[PDB]
């Protein structure tokens, strides 16, 4: 079966996403990224955007202190659980922006990086795309869905957006066929994005995920050539 975590499939699943967050194909590059992007999550930084605002970079800090006793984010623990749900600066700053570089130069840090990617971004994203009868291109749909809306069952969340696919289409796991169940997917996301000014873009589904379902390339193969905010990707 031809499913999202092959080698090579997992490697365009990263490029796709890191276009989407960092404008490169270049996904082993972007483990050093922080930025506050203004859109009132705070410090957003690493391979798949973990924000101070939202747990998951406290998480992720709080996992690498655990394997990697003394790496120079551990001291900004307390900062990172003060400023959680909220898009304060307050105790990180310079010292916490030198302290990521620094520990994204470290395989460790790296390491925790992937770890929480894959127990609650792209392992989730695969084992329910497998469950629904998902292609490689519906894993992708369900993964990029997890990295910029996140875990959960509210109605914008992954889990409520999934819920509203499913209200307006079979799954292929039902008999559903899988371009109209993705259709349904993408358009109950769109939604969703609209809400949000950060989000209001739309391409990284409309001129990359829309465009492989058009193409009907479901097992997400190379050669495959996309666009986000204007610009054009390709992966060979
Ligand atoms: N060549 C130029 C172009 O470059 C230029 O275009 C710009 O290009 C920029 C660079 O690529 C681009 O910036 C990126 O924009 C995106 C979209 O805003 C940013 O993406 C962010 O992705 C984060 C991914 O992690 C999101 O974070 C997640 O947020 C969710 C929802 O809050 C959270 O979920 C919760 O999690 C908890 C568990 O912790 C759970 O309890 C809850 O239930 C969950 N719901 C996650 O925790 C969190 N990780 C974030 O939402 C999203 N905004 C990215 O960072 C930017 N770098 C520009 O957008 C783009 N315009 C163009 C412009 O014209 O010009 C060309 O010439």
Redesign the pocket.
């Given at each position: 079966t031809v499913d999202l975590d092959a080698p090579v499939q997992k490697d365009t699943a990263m490029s796709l996403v890191s276009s989407?967050?960092?404008?490169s194909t270049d996904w082993q590059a972007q483990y050093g990224y922080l930025?506050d992007?203004a859109?009132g999550?705070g410090y957003?930084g690493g391979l798949?955007?973990?924000?101070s605002g939202?747990?998951?970079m406290l998480?992720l800090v709080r996992a690498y202190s655990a394997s990697s006793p003394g790496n120079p984010l551990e001291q900004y623990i307390p900062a990172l659980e003060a400023v959680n749900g909220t898009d304060s600066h307050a105790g990180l700053g310079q010292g916490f922006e030198q302290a990521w570089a620094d520990a994204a130069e470290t395989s460790e840090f790296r390491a925790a990086q992937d770890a929480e990617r894959d127990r609650?971004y792209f392992d989730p994203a695969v084992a329910q795309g497998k469950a629904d009868g998902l292609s490689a291109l519906g894993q992708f749909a369900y993964y990029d869905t997890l990295?910029?809306?996140?875990?959960?069952s509210?109605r914008?969340?992954f889990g409520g957006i999934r819920a509203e696919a499913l209200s307006a289409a079979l799954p292929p796991s039902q008999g559903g066929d899988e371009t109209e169940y993705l259709e349904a997917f993408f358009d109950a996301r769109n939604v969703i994005m609209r809400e949000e000014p950060?989000?209001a873009?739309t391409s990284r589904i409309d001129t990359a995920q829309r465009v492989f379902l058009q193409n009907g390339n479901f097992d997400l193969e190379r050669p495959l050539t996309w666009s986000v905010?204007?610009?054009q990707y390709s992966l060979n």
């Amino acid at each position: 079966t031809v499913d999202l975590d092959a080698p090579v499939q997992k490697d365009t699943a990263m490029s796709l996403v890191s276009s989407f967050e960092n404008s490169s194909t270049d996904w082993q590059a972007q483990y050093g990224y922080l930025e506050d992007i203004a859109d009132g999550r705070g410090y957003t930084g690493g391979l798949i955007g973990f924000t101070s605002g939202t747990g998951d970079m406290l998480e992720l800090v709080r996992a690498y202190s655990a394997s990697s006793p003394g790496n120079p984010l551990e001291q900004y623990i307390p900062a990172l659980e003060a400023v959680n749900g909220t898009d304060s600066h307050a105790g990180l700053g310079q010292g916490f922006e030198q302290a990521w570089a620094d520990a994204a130069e470290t395989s460790e840090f790296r390491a925790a990086q992937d770890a929480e990617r894959d127990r609650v971004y792209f392992d989730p994203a695969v084992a329910q795309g497998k469950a629904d009868g998902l292609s490689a291109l519906g894993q992708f749909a369900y993964y990029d869905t997890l990295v910029v809306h996140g875990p959960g069952s509210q109605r914008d969340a992954f889990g409520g957006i999934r819920a509203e696919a499913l209200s307006a289409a079979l799954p292929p796991s039902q008999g559903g066929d899988e371009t109209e169940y993705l259709e349904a997917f993408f358009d109950a996301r769109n939604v969703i994005m609209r809400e949000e000014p950060a989000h209001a873009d739309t391409s990284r589904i409309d001129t990359a995920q829309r465009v492989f379902l058009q193409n009907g390339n479901f097992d997400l193969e190379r050669p495959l050539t996309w666009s986000v905010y204007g610009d054009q990707y390709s992966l060979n």
